[PDB]
Design a protein around this ligand. Sequence first.
Ligand SMILES: Cc1cn([C@H]2C[C@H](O)[C@@H](COP(=O)(O)OP(=O)(O)OP(=O)(O)O)O2)c(=O)[nH]c1=O
Ligand SMILES: [Ca+2]
Ligand SMILES: [Ca+2]
Ligand SMILES: [Ca+2]
Ligand SMILES: [Ca+2]
Ligand SMILES: [Ca+2]
Ligand SMILES: [Ca+2]
Ligand SMILES: [Ca+2]
Ligand SMILES: [Ca+2]
Length: 903
Amino acid sequence: MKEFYLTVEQIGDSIFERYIDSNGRERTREVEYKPSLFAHCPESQATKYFDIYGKPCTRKLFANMRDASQWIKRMEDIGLEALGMDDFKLAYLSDTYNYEIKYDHTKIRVANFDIEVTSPDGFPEPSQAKHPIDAITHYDSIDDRFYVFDLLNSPYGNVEEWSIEIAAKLQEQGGDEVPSEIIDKIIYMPFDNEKELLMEYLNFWQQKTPVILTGWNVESFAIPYVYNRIKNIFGESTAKRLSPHRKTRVKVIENMYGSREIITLFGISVLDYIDLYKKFSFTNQPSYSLDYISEFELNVGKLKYDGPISKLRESNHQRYISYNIIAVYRVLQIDAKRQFINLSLDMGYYAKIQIQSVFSPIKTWDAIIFNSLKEQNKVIPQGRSHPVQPYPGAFVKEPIPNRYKYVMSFDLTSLYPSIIRQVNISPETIAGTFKVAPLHDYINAVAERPSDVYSCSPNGMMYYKDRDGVVPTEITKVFNQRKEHKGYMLAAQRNGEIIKEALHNPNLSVDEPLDVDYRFDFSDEIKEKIKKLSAKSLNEMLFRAQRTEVAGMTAQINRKLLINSLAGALGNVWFRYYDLRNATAITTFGQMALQWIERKVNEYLNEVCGTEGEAFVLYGDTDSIYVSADKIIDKVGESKFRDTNHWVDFLDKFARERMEPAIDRGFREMCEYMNNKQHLMFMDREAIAGPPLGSKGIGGFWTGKKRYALNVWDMEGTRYAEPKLKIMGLETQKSSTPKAVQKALKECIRRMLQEGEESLQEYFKEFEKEFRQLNYISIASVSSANNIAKYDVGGFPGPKCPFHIRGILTYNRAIKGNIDAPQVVEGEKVYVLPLREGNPFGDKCIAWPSGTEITDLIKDDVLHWMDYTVLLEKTFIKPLEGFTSAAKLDYEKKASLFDMFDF
DNA sequence: TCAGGTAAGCAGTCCGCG
DNA sequence: GCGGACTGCTTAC
Ligand SMILES: Cc1cn([C@H]2C[C@H](O)[C@@H](COP(=O)(O)OP(=O)(O)OP(=O)(O)O)O2)c(=O)[nH]c1=O
Ligand SMILES: [Ca+2]
Ligand SMILES: [Ca+2]
Ligand SMILES: [Ca+2]
Ligand SMILES: [Ca+2]
Ligand SMILES: [Ca+2]
Ligand SMILES: [Ca+2]
Ligand SMILES: [Ca+2]
Ligand SMILES: [Ca+2]
């Protein structure tokens, strides 16, 4: 076995490393690492070290790390660049692991934990830790066991032991429904006092020290609470045993409107699952309570209990403990699905960084580029100070608001990384500049050719063509990984649709799901066996295909994010390779590419249709074009098609055999015009969209930039069993829009695109009639809530107070002088409801914490004074009026001459 | 919301617009 | 009532 690190830290002049040795065992070592840094030297001096520009450098070896850091400061005092990796633990990792790391996850101790703290006087603040910790469940991945530490005696109540027998029972038996598959994996430990609980927890921690530490809100709550509680009871030295090197620090996390404190545990990598989820899930949720996310991800029910959480232990300790265990399990279930831990390990080891550094793409790229350059004996530049400056981004075409019946879209593969590779954009490949004409002149191919020697971007930048820069080289590697995983994702998607089709005709038999690899397109033999399977087996296969698709999605989308972030890192002042010339070279090239190809596609289609000056490209955003296919369908005639799938096949063939070759020729010409290193602008068909054949559906519509809806039959080669709505930007897609309203608007859109005006009118009339019956939570708006203090003037709205903030202030007055009432947390999300004139709350709206029922202190009054009329107009009617006006349809039936006959 | 980037939409405040 | 200047928030890319 090849060795690999687990954690690394600098503590004074020592590196502390936990690692897995060549025998598969966990070890710890302290190394008096002597770092090297670099200074420029005369050309006459012999060396093997050169900076990224080819200037010679001398290596300076220091007696210790403090000396190296002190030298950096003196070099600044003198006014000379101090070159090399100034983060010494990254240099240590590079020296110690000078090969591609192959890691074994089964040797890595991943701990998931959750704590309970009974608090009668509000939220138990981690910084204070004034209340006993009365439950800890700690799952260990190596043992595959849930360790449960249960406090039976507290100042807030003495309780009986938790019963595993009752826990396993159905809720209909009075049990807690702790999943049968984890019942045998629970190791239960009751304690008669908190001191013994915490002492045993620390001994346990010492025996089974987490490498990766995760859970839900562990970084902001569980970890600081445990640390501060142990500190309060036993003193600092005991609390620091949570670090394998006995070193901790309070770290201040600063944001624009305040700060918070966390505990850094040296020698542990904390990956709080709430933060993994926010970074890697590509969702925006109305609430981030574990309950809300578990329901969303797993379709598991809410963990139900009576009374407030502050009385749950006292009233129902059995359920209190069971729910603590289930909470830990739900995070593991989410990870089994999403695989964010696996992703973090993959990317961390690839870059050779502390695993927790995967949250920072700048840190990630700094390490990848450093390791790459080091291998060539090249020396990285010193990081410099830069003022933050704005720079231009993508082009977005202004669409004509309208219905659009038949639409085919086309999209460039990994645009920004492909631009970097094509142009050869890198710190060390800058060759100079040329005199820029207006962008319009390059788009229309009338500007003079920028260069006959160098590779160019229309922002004026020129790049070397003799060899790839380090940025293009390293971005290509991660791009290739992304491409592989996307392949697996798309195959699983296509396989899912095969199963959906088979589910139309399930067989009446008892059988089992097929053992197959969903990452690869099903063979003919598998397809034949699938046609003979029962619904139970097919549904099990569908679930497995969809889980495979999710795994592929996680792996691909976040690798996409990583490579895209390199383009943005070039525009971030903290990146070692910050250069607005390079950042702008990327975005400006993108603007040209989109508008260039718009012109080319319009020219091609005008030629094939025999017209002049007609716009076939109706829209584009960044790297995509949307093409009207009405005329293409009309040339064959709608009556000539047997069914919907027939014209979809036809448009698919037209895009692949005629349009893509024309698009490719257009981009190859653009490559020559800019004299680029390599043609990498690959624009493939994305969506085929239209109404069902023979229906009155409108197919699609646009209301404006970044606001449209399409009825899609085929997406990137996936032919759907049922048509799929692609809706971007509209209120159905916004977390701020009430849940039931999202649903209603989506059905309105479905009816518009698939069925027509009359169907839409029927549904509107019904929703308007019935909506007052909807649950208040389902019709509440959602908003993030920043700067509550700023707009608070003695409990009342100050000047320019935002609507959602006004709601919070209203809530605050209504719960005034009440410790048990849920508090709205600064920077978190709230539900918002309008209030009718003359209500007892004394204002036009109220807001409360999202993902929760409003406190019984005011619930019935909120329900009684809810302004349903305002709700409907603002969240439903106004957006719908926008959709229908754009589509040129009416959501209410207009008066006609036939009304004079009504019978 | 500690953690690559810009473009751009809509809600709402404040207040002008004879 | 709408629209501009502005803040706040949220998406598309
Ligand atoms: C989605 C996304 C795009 N972008 C920018 C960079 C992208 O290259 C460009 C186009 O966006 P996309 O077309 O969404 O993504 P992509 O072209 O990089 O990858 P794919 O092969 O899946 O089409 O917009 C971001 O900066 N951040 C993002 O999160
Ligand atoms: Ca809890
Ligand atoms: Ca398990
Ligand atoms: Ca793209
Ligand atoms: Ca594609
Ligand atoms: Ca069948
Ligand atoms: Ca795109
Ligand atoms: Ca795509
Ligand atoms: Ca009441």
